[PDB]
Every structure is written in structure tokens, then in C-alpha cells.
Design an enzyme around this catalytic site. Sequence first.
Site, mmCIF file in Angstrom:
data_model
loop_
_atom_site.group_PDB
_atom_site.id
_atom_site.type_symbol
_atom_site.label_atom_id
_atom_site.label_comp_id
_atom_site.label_asym_id
_atom_site.label_seq_id
_atom_site.Cartn_x
_atom_site.Cartn_y
_atom_site.Cartn_z
ATOM 1 C CB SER A 146 -0.936 -0.018 1.213
ATOM 2 O OG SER A 146 -2.002 0.905 1.053
ATOM 3 C CG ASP A 224 -7.138 -3.668 -1.641
ATOM 4 O OD1 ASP A 224 -7.678 -2.751 -0.991
ATOM 5 O OD2 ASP A 224 -5.922 -3.938 -1.549
ATOM 6 C CG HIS A 257 -5.194 -3.295 1.619
ATOM 7 N ND1 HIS A 257 -4.555 -2.899 0.465
ATOM 8 C CD2 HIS A 257 -4.772 -2.453 2.594
ATOM 9 C CE1 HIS A 257 -3.782 -1.857 0.729
ATOM 10 N NE2 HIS A 257 -3.899 -1.568 2.012
#
Lengths: 278, 278
Positions: A146, A224, A257
Amino acid sequence: LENISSVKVSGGWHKQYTHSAVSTHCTMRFAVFLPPGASESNKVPVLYWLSGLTCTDENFMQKAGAFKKAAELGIAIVAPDTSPRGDNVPNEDSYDFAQGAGFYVNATQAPYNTHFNMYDYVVNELPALIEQHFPVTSTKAISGHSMGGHGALMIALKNPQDYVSASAFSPIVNPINCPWGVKAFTGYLGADKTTWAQYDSCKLMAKAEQSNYLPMLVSQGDADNFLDEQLKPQNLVAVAKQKDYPLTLEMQTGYDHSYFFISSFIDQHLVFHHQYLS
Amino acid sequence: LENISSVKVSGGWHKQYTHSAVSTHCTMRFAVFLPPGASESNKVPVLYWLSGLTCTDENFMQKAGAFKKAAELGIAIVAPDTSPRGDNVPNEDSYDFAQGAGFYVNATQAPYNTHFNMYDYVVNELPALIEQHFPVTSTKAISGHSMGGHGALMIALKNPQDYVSASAFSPIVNPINCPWGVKAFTGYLGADKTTWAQYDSCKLMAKAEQSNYLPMLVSQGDADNFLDEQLKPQNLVAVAKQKDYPLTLEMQTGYDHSYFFISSFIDQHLVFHHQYLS
Ligand SMILES: [Cl-]
Ligand SMILES: [Cl-]
């Protein structure tokens, strides 16, 4: 430089250290994994891992499950913190800004200009410290998740001759065009968006020189929850295809995620980097 | 039965559920990993994993890194909690007693006898529930760590015909002769030590019937801080030798009591159980 923890795992060793960082003007903690057999007479290459929002070095080391394959490929792993820390460092309540969220840039706006220089920390200060005190060579690669994915690809693009390859999991490829990035850039860099471009992977890749192209891999789960509002992987692909940049982005169906996702493809990334690290 | 979380990992699925447990008279949370391909028309064997003191189902699922190999071998993993939970359930600050420390026994002393029936929970209620709501078969094996290691070997010895094999990491093999066992057994079972024997692996193995012998693997790091005071693996090695019990106990030099240790050899155990589960 103080060793605060040490544990054996997969024939190798995981160790945490603390040190007074000059770039962040504060004590910083980082984790290092040395594959089995690493020594001054048998130095090993290094993969730098940048974590995301609210993370520290521990998240990856404890939940990625990267040791098994890293030990096998003889790859060392350095996982730095995600921002400066302490009561003498500015901070706010939000999880997406300030402490735990440095966005790997060098803040120019006060009061963040003093300690929020995670860019210099990851790019210059840490690597220098690592190579000077650990059984490693200067050959290195970088990856992350991320905010850390954004960091890895952005740092690679900006230092084409110093990294052999780069990868990322659920990266924020176009910070300039997402809430997380706009907020981070405004606070750290100011309202003059022209200064933001130097930290955006999409902007950086577009102006990249063919001779500096380097192997890139990106993994992204299509489940995600941050896919469309913050990540926007297609933005980078579009740019990569304009430049014929050697980027491979793969959507993984059903994944999210979390680190359950990262652990599911971390080995693919280690094999990927191993090819260039050696 | 209520599903509270779901995530994809290594092609399979990791899910957490809660339900009103009869044995523990309280709501209980457990996690389950179904390897890729598991379905009503394609059921898979199960490996029960018992955790140690202070743990829940998450520690193992997040830190053991068992999914790659389990998905590869087609093994489902069930990780129950370590005790009953709730503000109406007895508890105290001690990390080694009450909640997070059920020691997999059926408490006979009030007020613990009401909710502390983890033996009944893990041995009878849970398996029935699992086989009822999931694409699993009746074939199962059991493993665990520390207090859970004690639980695994003890449960297998007490139900020789219901488990194909058993293994453990840093198990408390002789609870009757260590502080952790004495404290737990005294509170849960009372001062009469004769009622403790039925939950002690060494006592149990000593009375095992030849035709009920089953494969056993134990992994113990020699750098485990609780080795000599709480675990005492050699106590079990002695009994096994007198009984010709098929127990293989290996000392892993340099490893500790953590999940870094567990993650280092969980694959070995999975391969171990795979042989008997198929
Ligand atoms: Cl600052
Ligand atoms: Cl109770």
C-alpha cells in the site's frame, strides 16, 4: 545501534534494532532477517520491505511468512518503520497521516519538515547503516505494501541505478489522484501540487528514460476494499504501456488488502527479485 | 453458527465463526482454513490446532504460515479458542490461569466447572459442529503448541481410535510436575492429585494399549525459556521408551518458544500428518 531482539527462524535469524536516526531526528526501530550462512565471508544481497499505514517492522516479519523462501534463496530482508516516532515528533489522531504514515517522502512543510524524511531514511541513511554493520553486499531490491508499495515503486523509479528490481502489493500508484495522497501531500509538501509530482509513481514512470527501466512486479487483489478509491492500479498500467516500461501487474481474484494476501504471493516476489539480485 | 470474517489465502479460505457452545456455556470463536478445492462433493481431512496460554485462534492463523503447505496437501485446519470467554465467565489477571488458559480439561471445581470444559469442547462438541457445517471428512489429526501441545498429545492418547496421528510444539508433557500444571490443575481439578493423572500425557502414555499406539512427532527448541521449568520433554521420552511408543521427539537447536519457531517446522508437521490423514 542497539540489538533489542533476536530469534531463530527457518535456519536464519530475525533481529530488531534501534538507533538514533539523523534523517528523522529520532530513535528508529527496524527489523532484519539474515538467511542461513550469511557472514562477513559470505555476504548476501538485500530486499528492502516498506510497510503501509499504521504498520511497523513487526507486521511483515510476523505475518508475511517470507523467511522460508528467503532463507532458501539466500536473501536478507530489512524492514524499516513507516515514520519517525515519539512525543517529540508531531502527530495527529488520523491513522492516514503523520506518525505511522510518512508516505516515504521528505516533508518540506513545517512542522513535519524536521522528522518526516522517511525518503532519505529509506534511500540513504538505512542502507548505509545496513551495509556497514551487517553481512550484506550493496546489491539491493525493494518492495512494499500500500503506502509502502507506493514507496517502493516511487523510490525505485527515482533511483534507477541503485536498485536491481522493484515490486509491490496493493500499491497507491497515483497518490496525486487519491484522498490518502492528496491529504499526505498537502500536509507534508504544501498546496503547490507541482512539488507532488516528484513523489507520484505514475508521474515518475511517464518521464522515465528507457535506459533506466527496471523489472517491476505488482500484485493486487480484486477484493481490496481500497482498490478504486485509493489504489487505482490501472493508472500505472496505462502509463507503463505508454512507455513500454517492464511492469507486470497481476490482479489476484478474491484477495484483499491484508497480510493473508501478501503471504499468498510473497514467495513469487522473492523469486522475482532473486533473479536480479543474483 | 455465525461467520464473522472471511479472507482468501493460498488459494483456500480462512474464516472465523462464533456460536453458542453448550459445553462451555458461552459464545465461542474459532477459525477454519479450507484448502483450495474443498466442497460438498470434495471433502477434506482436518488437522485440529490447539493454542497455548493467552492465545486465541488468530495467533496461529496469522503467524504460523501454515496455509501454503496445507493448501498444497489438501488439509483443512481448525483452530479453536483456548478457553471460554465473556464477562460472566470467571477470570483473573494471571496469564497462566482462567481465561486464555483452560488447559483443555473439564473443570470439576466451582465456579470453573460451569464454563471451563475445553476438553469436552475440543473433543466432542467442536468436531461435531465442524463436520456438520463444513466440507470436511471424519478423518482428523491433532497438534498444538505448549499448553496446546499438552492438549494435543493428551487428547490423542485419550481417544486413540478417533485421531490418526498427533504432534506438538514445545508441549507441557508432564503438567503434574510443573508450575503451570500444578496451578491450573489445583484451581480446575482441586487438591486431589489423583484426578490430575487423566490429563497428564506422561501418565496417559504409560497406560496406553499396544494396538492403540499412534504416530507422534514433537518439536522442541533448545533455546526455549520454559524448557526446563515447564516443558520437560525428556519426561515423555522416558515413558515412550518404556512403552515402545512410536514417539519421535526432536530438539531444534537455537529455536525458542515463539511462532517464529512454529512457522519454521509447521510444514514438517503437515507432511507428517498428511501421511496418516490420507
Ligand atoms: Cl517533524
Ligand atoms: Cl465457569
